[PDB]
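Quick note —
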Amino acid sequence: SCSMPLGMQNKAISDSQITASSHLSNIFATWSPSQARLHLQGRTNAWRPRVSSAEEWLQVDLQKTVKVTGITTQGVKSLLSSMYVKEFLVSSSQDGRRWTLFLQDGHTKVFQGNQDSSTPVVNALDPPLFTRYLRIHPTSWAQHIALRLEVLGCEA
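Predicted structure written out below.
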């Protein structure tokens, strides 16, 4: 049914394949892009950008052409702060240079994401993407932008 996890949770997608516009790092903590893995626990267990704006993104390089059929998102709780992305855009690319924004009915698609810090939310991509690179662009968030991710799809 072409909807299998492509490797964020299980590390089939390696740390070096995940990058971002920026990330939050100070002398105790780094919320690195490679922490953006679905269901990850332990310390600083999500990606957070250096500052929360609408110009940030999390990028995954799948390293080959994949049929991408969906994206799963999750927030994170840190101390008293419950953080999650409420809405986001998706862009994609074959070369990592030229990006195509995901549309619905000819217009920019706003994906409805999370409404808490721990529940995963699956979003279908219709039409599906045949692509190598994906970016998630947060456009609305609670408290701060934080992301744990899975990408769903299959070979061909």
